[PDB]
Amino acid sequence: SMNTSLLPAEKDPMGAAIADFYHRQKADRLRVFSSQFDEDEIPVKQLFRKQMPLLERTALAMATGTILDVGAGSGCHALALQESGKEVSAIDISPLSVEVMKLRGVKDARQVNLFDERFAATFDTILMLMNGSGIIGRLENMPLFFRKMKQLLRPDGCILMDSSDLRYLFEDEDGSFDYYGEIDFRMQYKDIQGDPFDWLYIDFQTLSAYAADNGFKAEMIKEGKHYDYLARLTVAL
Numbered sequence: 605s606m607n608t609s610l611l612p613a614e615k616d617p618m619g620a621a622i623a624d625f626y627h628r629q630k631a632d633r634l635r636v637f638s639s640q641f642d643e644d645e646i647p648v649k650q651l652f653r654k655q656m657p658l659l660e661r662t663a664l665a666m667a668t669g670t671i672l673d674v675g676a677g678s679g680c681h682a683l684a685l686q687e688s689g690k691e692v693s694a695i696d697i698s699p700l701s702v703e704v705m706k707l708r709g710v711k712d713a714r715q716v717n718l719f720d721e722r723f724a725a726t727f728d729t730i731l732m733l734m735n736g737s738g739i740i741g742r743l744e745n746m747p748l749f750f751r752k753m754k755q756l757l758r759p760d761g762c763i764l765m766d767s768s769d770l771r772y773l774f775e776d777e778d779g780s781f782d783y784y785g786e787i788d789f790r791m792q793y794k795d796i797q798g799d800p801f802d803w804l805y806i807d808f809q810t811l812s813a814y815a816a817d818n819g820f821k822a823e824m825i826k827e828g829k830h831y832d833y834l835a836r837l838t839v840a841l
């Protein structure tokens with residue numbers, strides 16, 4: 605099912621990049637394609653940042669109690685939290701990313717899809733960082749997302765999520781303008797081809813509206829300098 609799907613290692617380009625760098629301290633380029641944007645790269649060394657950006661640093665410092673690191677990748681956030689003495693569980697659908705996390709010393713790294721009906725555990729803080737909205741994919745998945753959050757959150761728990769308003773990319777020189785933040789991507793590493801995926805960017809007002817429609821409250825915590833922000837989502841009282 606869509607909700608339980610994991611990446612096969614043979615179609616796991618980001619995991620393969622991470623594993624090359626972990627095992628060999630060297631890597632080819634992780635290439636990113638899109639129907640909306642020209643071909644680019646995701647720098648691989650930066651996936652191992654200790655050096656994190658403002659919004660991510662802000663979120664880690666605020667994270668308390670039992671923490672879920674969603675889409676944890678190389679384990680950078682999970683390792684930072686462990687070093688603070690914090691309790692963290694990390695999840696990712698990438699098998700090679702989970703391999704690396706374990707070998708780097710993440711104590712509780714699991715290969716599981718956030719949306720899996722069988723994934724059941726509760727948390728005081730749920731971290732969705734590095735365009736944390738991405739995993740949601742499309743606005744039509746907002747109800748599913750908030751249903752899952754209700755299952756995973758302890759009383760007085762919160763979700764800390766960063767995203768970006770991409771409107772500026774879709775305007776002409778004079779500012780004249782599916783939701784524009786519904787992007788698709790596909791990645792390639794060496795001869796490893798990943799399947800295309802939906803990756804949601806969401807502006808704060810849109811996020812607040814969908815939160816309110818699903819029994820959540822959104823709070824702006826911090827703005828960055830490139831149309832980016834950190835929000836806190838909680839179950840509405």
Ligand SMILES: Nc1ncnc2c1ncn2[C@@H]1O[C@H](CSCC[C@H](N)C(=O)O)[C@@H](O)[C@H]1O
Nearest residue numbers: 675676677695696697698717718733734739
């Ligand atoms: N449904 C899902 N459940 C869990 N992890 C998912 C997911 N969909 C995507 N992912 C993972 O989310 C990650 C997004 S990339 C961001 C990685 C990491 N948080 C960092 O800041 O560097 C990838 O590792 C990807 O495999």
